[PDB]
Design a protein around this ligand. Sequence first.
Ligand SMILES: O=c1ccn([C@@H]2O[C@H](COP(=O)(O)O)[C@@H](O)[C@H]2O)c(=O)[nH]1
Ligand SMILES: O=c1ccn([C@@H]2O[C@H](COP(=O)(O)O)[C@@H](O)[C@H]2O)c(=O)[nH]1
Ligand SMILES: O=c1ccn([C@@H]2O[C@H](COP(=O)(O)O)[C@@H](O)[C@H]2O)c(=O)[nH]1
Ligand SMILES: O=c1ccn([C@@H]2O[C@H](COP(=O)(O)O)[C@@H](O)[C@H]2O)c(=O)[nH]1
Ligand SMILES: O=c1ccn([C@@H]2O[C@H](COP(=O)(O)O)[C@@H](O)[C@H]2O)c(=O)[nH]1
Ligand SMILES: O=c1ccn([C@@H]2O[C@H](COP(=O)(O)O)[C@@H](O)[C@H]2O)c(=O)[nH]1
Ligand SMILES: [Mg+2]
Lengths: 226, 208, 221, 207, 214, 206
Amino acid sequence: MNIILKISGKFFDEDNVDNLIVLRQSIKELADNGFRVGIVTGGGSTARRYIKLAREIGIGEAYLDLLGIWASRLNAYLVMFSLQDLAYMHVPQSLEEFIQDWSHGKVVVTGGFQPGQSTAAVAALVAEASSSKTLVVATNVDGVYEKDPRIYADVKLIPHLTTQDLRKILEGSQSVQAGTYELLDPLAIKIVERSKIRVIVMNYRKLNRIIDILKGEEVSSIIEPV
Amino acid sequence: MNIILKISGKFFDEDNVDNLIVLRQSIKELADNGFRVGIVTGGGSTARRYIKLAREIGIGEAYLDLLGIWASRLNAYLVMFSLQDLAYMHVPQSLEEFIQDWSHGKVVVTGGFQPGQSTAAVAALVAEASSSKTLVVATNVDGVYKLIPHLTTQDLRKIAGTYELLDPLAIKIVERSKIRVIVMNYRKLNRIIDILKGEEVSSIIEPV
Amino acid sequence: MNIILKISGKFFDEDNVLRQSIKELADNGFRVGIVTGGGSTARRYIKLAREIGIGEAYLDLLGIWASRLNAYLVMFSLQDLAYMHVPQSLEEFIQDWSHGKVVVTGGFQPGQSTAAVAALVAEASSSKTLVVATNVDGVYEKDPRIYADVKLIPHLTTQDLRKILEGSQSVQAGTYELLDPLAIKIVERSKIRVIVMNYRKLNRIIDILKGEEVSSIIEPV
Amino acid sequence: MNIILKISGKFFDEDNVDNLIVLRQSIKELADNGFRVGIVTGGGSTARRYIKLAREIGIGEAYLDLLGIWASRLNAYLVMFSLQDLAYMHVPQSLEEFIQDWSHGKVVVTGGFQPGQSTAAVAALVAEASSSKTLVVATNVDGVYEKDPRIYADVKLIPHLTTQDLRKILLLDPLAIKIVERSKIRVIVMNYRKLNRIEVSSIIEPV
Amino acid sequence: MNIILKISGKFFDEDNVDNLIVLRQSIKELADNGFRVGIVTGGGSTARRYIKLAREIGIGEAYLDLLGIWASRLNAYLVMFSLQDLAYMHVPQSLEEFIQDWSHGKVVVTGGFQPGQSTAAVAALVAEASSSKTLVVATNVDGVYEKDPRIYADVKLIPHLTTQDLRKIELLDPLAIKIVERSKIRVIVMNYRKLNRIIDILKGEEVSSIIEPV
Amino acid sequence: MNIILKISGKFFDEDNVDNLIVLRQSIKELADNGFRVGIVTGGGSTARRYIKLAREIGIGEAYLDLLGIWASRLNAYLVMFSLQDLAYMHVPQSLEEFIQDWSHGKVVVTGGFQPGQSTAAVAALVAEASSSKTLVVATNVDGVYEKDPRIYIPHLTTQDLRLLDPLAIKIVERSKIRVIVMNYRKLNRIIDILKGEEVSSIIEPV
Ligand SMILES: O=c1ccn([C@@H]2O[C@H](COP(=O)(O)O)[C@@H](O)[C@H]2O)c(=O)[nH]1
Ligand SMILES: O=c1ccn([C@@H]2O[C@H](COP(=O)(O)O)[C@@H](O)[C@H]2O)c(=O)[nH]1
Ligand SMILES: O=c1ccn([C@@H]2O[C@H](COP(=O)(O)O)[C@@H](O)[C@H]2O)c(=O)[nH]1
Ligand SMILES: O=c1ccn([C@@H]2O[C@H](COP(=O)(O)O)[C@@H](O)[C@H]2O)c(=O)[nH]1
Ligand SMILES: O=c1ccn([C@@H]2O[C@H](COP(=O)(O)O)[C@@H](O)[C@H]2O)c(=O)[nH]1
Ligand SMILES: O=c1ccn([C@@H]2O[C@H](COP(=O)(O)O)[C@@H](O)[C@H]2O)c(=O)[nH]1
Ligand SMILES: [Mg+2]
């Protein structure tokens, strides 16, 4: 019924966002299928660019994060604007505001909320508040591979893993990976575990097939909370 | 310089808060010494009571945290109302709102911000946002437990009296911004200055 | 038909509930608005504050926030049926009520009780009936606590209430729930009936409204 | 220290509001004498006109009060705009927002807050919240006069009286009286055609 | 279909109650016919009154415009209060707030937004933001005439004209024309007394002047 | 007294860090000399990038301008965060909010307000709302020339000018606000620019 979609910041760094016209139909799709969708956008290059500039002039860490949040919010406005008619036209700046906005029965798009965390924590918090039992993380890769792609030749996709692995990475005993990196946040892990939120890592080029994803008729990796 | 005072929720579980009268005077002088002060209040028994009532009927975790957050905001208002004239009359509900409130040059009293963390995390976020190098945690004990005069966040990461800053986000923030955490008894708010100097009893957690 | 439900503060002082009736009322074509009292949490914070010399306006504000804590509790237990926002003024309530969902609210302004808030909200939502849920079955001929073998009063008027304010009549648990000038002024000018009943009977709100269950109704005159 | 000034709505029904120019001077002078000022404006004929119109089309009582309130706020914006630099540029819509605005140490101008009361109640609520011990009411009259003088046609102003005397010789609605009484706020009644320095008026003591 | 209705400030001065009744009456009409309506109210005499009152004591221009804007909001609440249950009970104070309010799927009523423009521009901004292809301007006259009919004889209503044509010879200001032109919004000028016949107006079955964007 | 500083979008593109540094330093200089400063930031390349991106998927014109506005606010937050303690920590999203934020007696940093206009209009509205008699426009050019130096003026007037959009011209004219055009690189000498002792073109209201 309720689902949260986390769009990696990378999505906003490519030549275009035509994928949004797709997501737009994907959302209409999911919609007609009796599925409500919440969306969280990352900061991408715009955030890294402003954070770096602010760091070179002495800005404190708290404020660097705020600039990353405002960048992620600019991406949320872009998405919200492409979803006219389907979305509640307001970007909540905190989880409490999200709860109010979600209260309107339409799609809600959000950026970051608070310093000291990434948008993955946001997507987790929002999935919990909206009683979403499934969080879909859309990044620029098909899913989680048994071994780091770019490093090791021809690797296969892991059909599923547990949250315990995401933290085995945060330690340093398991190499990060594009697709696992999008979820390396303790609060995110704590939230998906305490609320037992299933996480699906997939490629944002497959949004047109997100329903197949939710069914299993399509490539991706499932992170099961434990 | 700026300092943040985190008041344990236990402080509000007593049949008396006359202690706030001393805090009042503390801040005046503290200000006269050039100190700015931010205050963060805990939830205490009111928070625990509502979380339990809500939990018994099946309320979700997110909303349980929100109830604890509101309970702590009630304590924030009590403290703010007792500081009238010394404080900006508004309880911010997020770190961003805190930054705007702190901009008025007055004392700012806050409760919790977001589910999945404690007010200790709030205190650390605010200390960081206000450029405070010291976060004081006033509790119903003299320090961490004989009393340990000094310890590190690394000891905390090994996760009584220590229960306060036992929150991952709080730890991450104090470590990245290197904020010293002074744990002391709120009954001794009259000597925070001596405490801050290191001449009175307390436990100080060093950021590592 | 719109109706307002004022939940007495005592409701929150026990150890545990209204989600039930709201679904029913809803299905009978009723929109519901809810107001929560402050209860023991309010009295505790007001006493604490008073002891250290906090001014009256602020003591009321503490009472209001305590009432809001109870509002959030109720709202959180009503997820999906309720608009997720607690209005802090009658004006905010008007906007909130506009979404077509259940609205839960606490106090608005110093110098009044949530009974006043319940009256204002009933007027603004065009509710012709305000139900006051308390820990007693209604109003009684004589005070039940002080007098024995007393019968419940099925009907009385707003003039009876102000007689009590004038010190001409005696208070009661049920009556206490509505003793304040503003609430009285509002229900009188907008002719809103006020049903005083036991919250243990919230599941019987339909028959209460029809007049087929025990309660005391205060007529606007 | 703190003072609340309540301006009758009729003040805004005149041909001009030039006295707002002097009011600004009086505020600066009071300020320079260690006095902080808060202002509350009434609705006047603008409020009466919109209410009458709305009432004719069936608008409910709560909303009729809301139109009176927005009218009082328009007058509040006019006064606030004339006081630029001396005032916090925001018109609070509730006692709670007033507390927040009053927090800036500048003059605060406000209209009504909630249906069911007059701006007299508002001015009282605000005087209580601002620790003001004196509420000045600029009305259409010079003060309180005796309705039944022993001699026929003899009109004598009452320079002094109590909140009870008032409660008997009856602008100051219930909430207002309760608020001034519980917080022992002194009320100075004068006409909206004169100057604030301390002169003819009617002072009401809370008892 | 989304449509915006701009109500002249004069509407609130004379023939008061009947004007409000026909407007409510017509809003319910538009709703019955499958239209989503947005409403923008002018400041009228209340606005000119406060602006004059303020200009006489030296209030700056930005603030005079602000008083005019508050005057229009008072008219907005009046209309909004007469449309209870049909409208989102909130008056937005900026285009961004309007977009949010419009999201509730109900009728939205607004006054001005920012100093230096008229409600005409607001009505244009709102028509554009709500994806309205038609902006109705309900004034006290029947339509657009070559010359003011109150001075010149033998002058007839112009059924059709362009923004260029309008630009040469209250109705639409500089930003309004710019907005309706970049978003190709059709503007219908008509008499608010004929609001009770708005459906027949849209079907070109009744008297009005239609301005096409160019 | 009161002055508004309009900062061109280009400022946030090339020679980034040094521009931000000189700015916060000039703001601190202005504050030491009894000047109340208001800052208006343009959207720059961030703005153009998003508007282009949105336009390509068919986002309407009103929303394109809003993206341009949010981008200018991003630049505003950046400047604001570099001026902590000197600035009121809030970016107003409308003229009315600006008036409220200006009441705080601190430096205010703002981006755009409403669609259909440029930040030049915002700078003008803000100068008017804040009783600012002078509006400084900081761009990557020393000022105004008799002929632009790419195909071939110390003082001039508004009608002499007929850079500035319609609303801007209208507001500056009706409130008689002097506009000083200069090179943001020379922000290190704003005090002199204000006295008239440095390269700059001053536009006079008529
Ligand atoms: O709740 C949030 C969301 C985002 N960010 C900032 O935005 C960056 C961009 O977010 P993301 O794209 O990495 O998730 C984060 O790394 C961080 O600095 C935060 O501080 N808190
Ligand atoms: O930023 C916050 C502050 C408080 N709380 C809730 O309030 C309780 C009371 O806070 P504290 O007194 O334990 O700090 C926490 O345990 C928790 O459920 C949160 O979720 N987030
Ligand atoms: O609009 C309101 C609602 C509540 N209260 C404060 O909250 C207490 C709790 O309200 P109730 O439960 O008695 O209605 C009141 O007695 C009083 O001090 C107010 O001042 N104003
Ligand atoms: O807190 C308030 C202030 C004003 N008004 C409405 O505004 C009118 C104008 O206010 P005043 O000039 O009578 O004080 C009142 O008579 C009344 O209908 C209220 O309902 N509540
Ligand atoms: O977005 C707006 C709307 C209204 N007004 C002020 O309100 C007056 C009344 O509006 P209207 O009836 O001319 O449209 C305008 O002339 C003007 O001073 C503005 O400044 N900006
Ligand atoms: O009040 C404003 C401010 C900015 N913008 C948008 O932001 C862009 C960047 O602003 P600027 O740098 O051109 O001023 C503008 O071209 C435009 O699309 C607006 O629509 N309205
Ligand atoms: Mg009146």
